[PDB]
Amino acid sequence: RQFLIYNEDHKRCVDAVSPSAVQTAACNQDAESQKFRWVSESQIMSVAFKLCLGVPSKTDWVAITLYACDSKSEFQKWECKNDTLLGIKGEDLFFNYGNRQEKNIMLYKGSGLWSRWKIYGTTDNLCSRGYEAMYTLLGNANGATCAFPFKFENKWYADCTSAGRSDGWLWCGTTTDYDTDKLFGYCPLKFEGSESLWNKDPLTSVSYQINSKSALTWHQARKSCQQQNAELLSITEIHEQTYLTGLTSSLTSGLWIGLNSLSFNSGWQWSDRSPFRYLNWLPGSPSAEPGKSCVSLNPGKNAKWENLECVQKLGYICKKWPYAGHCYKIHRDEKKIQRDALTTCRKEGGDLTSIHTIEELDFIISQLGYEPNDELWIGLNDIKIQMYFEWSDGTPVTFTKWLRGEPSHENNRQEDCVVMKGKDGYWADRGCEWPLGYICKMK
Ligand SMILES: [Ca+2]
């Protein structure tokens, strides 16, 4: 994530000589004085000096030297324009070198070959290696992001470090002055022992990271799992939900899971695109309140799920007619209830239709004769195991497309069968004792 600043024309890299002298030198990957890194969306810091590149004013031909890193300073913000060009944010003044025998980097109005810089060893501009906020693990910062650079025992560190430790674990300070604030966390990076944070289910080889100490938003939490090559927890099996109930049996604070309702066109879904085929809501949830689109697993309430406003700060859990060999047919003439429609499809040699891909769903709606005012049965049901939807034909449930607000599966309404209704062909659950069309499927 650290880079050298290279000027292709000169064949020279930027070199930090002193906090008040930023110049150039023969490129050297091992010369720490030449290494830099993005520490914010707009700040470029020196790795050797832990100081940020800036200017005294946004005026033509001033000296670019190192400054104390300041997230509020308009004079330390850089941005890429017209690809390689590197200029001060908000002005047509650029990172220049070479004019008028000046060995120091200068902010110049020209946009020639001496104002364009690439990441040494690549053909990309500096912005290609942009800053990625790093959410801490464990620690006492409640999941806050690393702050670079930070001061620890009167030394400045530009990256995660194991200083003050013998176990090689990498950590960082979430504030600039760690020695004073004492707020820290471990870095979401690889290091001998990093897997200690993950619980590996011996049944399915799936890994889970339980971050009960952090306090992040739903969207922040998801990025934490993502930056660890993972995603928010998805629960698609009873034995899975139970396992997490065991791991969190001793906790009490709610934990973000991947269950959200953020696609305003569809219903409940998992952030990792897992099929929403298992329900385990808390009494009173999902609530009728419109702002609550994100779901939390509450280990203090039997590990059941509740939906809350996505900005609430909580802990989180990471996780790490023929078509395609079948023949489909719609029945609208004589309408039947679910169990009767099921018998008919089985007498006709098949079963109630199962849907496993968007391609299969797109086929049913566009070809089989579907009309946007339809409401037809499908094989998705939870008659056998309440709250566990399976396909009537016994095939795996790998796909779900719920209508906005579905599956409601309200407490005492026995909504155990699923129908395909609406203009978009999405699904919904309802009582099984109602006459409706149905869709059969066979080989
Ligand atoms: Ca319903």
Side-chain angles (χ1 to χ4, degrees), residues 365-383:
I365 63 179
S366 71
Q367 288 208 60
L368 220 66
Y370 186 77
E371 294 170 341
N373 287 332
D374 277 320
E375 182 167 353
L376 326 179
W377 291 114
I378 57 176
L380 196 62
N381 72 86
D382 69 335
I383 300 168

Side-chain angles (χ1 to χ4, degrees), residues 243-305:
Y243 185 61
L244 276 288
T245 297
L247 293 187
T248 71
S249 64
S250 50
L251 302 175
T252 47
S253 303
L255 312 177
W256 284 127
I257 58 175
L259 192 57
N260 67 97
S261 84
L262 293 180
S263 295
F264 82 87
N265 194 29
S266 57
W268 297 109
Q269 55 191 15
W270 294 103
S271 57
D272 61 21
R273 288 168 304 280
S274 297
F276 182 62
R277 55 89 70 90
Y278 175 62
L279 284 65
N280 182 44
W281 296 99
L282 274 179
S285 293
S287 79
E289 299 188 39
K292 308 186 173 182
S293 302
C294 294
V295 175
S296 151
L297 179 160
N298 190 330
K301 295 181 183 172
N302 295 325
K304 294 189 176 300
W305 314 339

Side-chain angles (χ1 to χ4, degrees), residues 405-410 415 417 421 428-431:
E406 309 285 326
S408 55
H409 199 72
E410 301 183 356
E415 302 189 23
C417 295
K421 81 171 187 177
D429 57 6
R430 56 171 299 117

Side-chain angles (χ1 to χ4, degrees), residues 4 10 24 28 53 59 68 74 135 173 187 201 239 259 274-275 304 376 379 422-423:
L4 281 60
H10 280 101
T24 57
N28 177 9
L53 292 166
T59 63
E74 286 289 280
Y135 298 84
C187 285
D201 186 352
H239 65 101
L259 192 57
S274 297
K304 294 189 176 300
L376 326 179
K423 61 173 194 299

Side-chain angles (χ1 to χ4, degrees), residues 195-430:
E195 292 308 298
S196 310
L197 306 172
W198 299 84
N199 287 285
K200 190 173 188 171
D201 186 352
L203 188 71
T204 60
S205 287
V206 180
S207 297
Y208 306 93
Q209 178 184 81
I210 302 183
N211 293 284
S212 56
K213 306 303 175 184
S214 298
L216 304 178
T217 57
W218 188 90
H219 295 277
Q220 289 174 347
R222 187 183 184 183
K223 182 56 181 184
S224 181
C225 299
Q226 289 184 341
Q227 65 184 185
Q228 299 184 74
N229 299 122
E231 257 282 4
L232 283 174
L233 178 70
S234 62
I235 310 172
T236 64
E237 306 290 348
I238 294 178
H239 65 101
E240 189 169 22
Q241 163 78 30
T242 308
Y243 185 61
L244 276 288
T245 297
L247 293 187
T248 71
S249 64
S250 50
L251 302 175
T252 47
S253 303
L255 312 177
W256 284 127
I257 58 175
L259 192 57
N260 67 97
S261 84
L262 293 180
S263 295
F264 82 87
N265 194 29
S266 57
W268 297 109
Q269 55 191 15
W270 294 103
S271 57
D272 61 21
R273 288 168 304 280
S274 297
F276 182 62
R277 55 89 70 90
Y278 175 62
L279 284 65
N280 182 44
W281 296 99
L282 274 179
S285 293
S287 79
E289 299 188 39
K292 308 186 173 182
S293 302
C294 294
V295 175
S296 151
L297 179 160
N298 190 330
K301 295 181 183 172
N302 295 325
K304 294 189 176 300
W305 314 339
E306 61 174 329
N307 56 328
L308 319 168
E309 308 198 21
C310 295
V311 299
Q312 191 163 153
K313 294 190 169 297
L314 307 175
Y316 58 107
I317 302 182
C318 298
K319 181 183 179 180
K320 191 168 63 170
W321 305 119
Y323 165 80
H326 295 265
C327 279
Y328 307 76
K329 176 184 181 183
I330 293 181
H331 287 259
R332 319 155 172 269
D333 43 342
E334 187 184 347
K335 292 178 295 184
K336 307 178 175 183
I337 65 177
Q338 191 263 343
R339 84 177 52 87
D340 287 339
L342 188 66
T343 326
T344 301
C345 295
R346 290 177 175 173
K347 287 185 184 302
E348 300 189 350
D351 199 316
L352 276 176
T353 187
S354 58
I355 307 175
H356 298 106
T357 65
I358 190 61
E359 290 75 23
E360 187 172 0
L361 176 63
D362 284 338
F363 166 77
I364 292 179
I365 63 179
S366 71
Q367 288 208 60
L368 220 66
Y370 186 77
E371 294 170 341
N373 287 332
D374 277 320
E375 182 167 353
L376 326 179
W377 291 114
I378 57 176
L380 196 62
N381 72 86
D382 69 335
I383 300 168
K384 304 196 302 184
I385 303 176
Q386 177 72 352
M387 307 300 179
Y388 186 76
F389 286 97
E390 319 168 57
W391 285 119
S392 61
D393 63 23
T395 58
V397 172
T398 67
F399 176 94
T400 58
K401 259 292 175 187
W402 297 100
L403 270 179
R404 186 56 172 180
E406 309 285 326
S408 55
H409 199 72
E410 301 183 356
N411 280 19
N412 296 123
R413 310 311 159 83
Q414 302 162 306
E415 302 189 23
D416 296 353
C417 295
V418 178
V419 305
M420 177 180 313
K421 81 171 187 177
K423 61 173 194 299
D424 299 290
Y426 295 158
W427 311 346
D429 57 6
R430 56 171 299 117

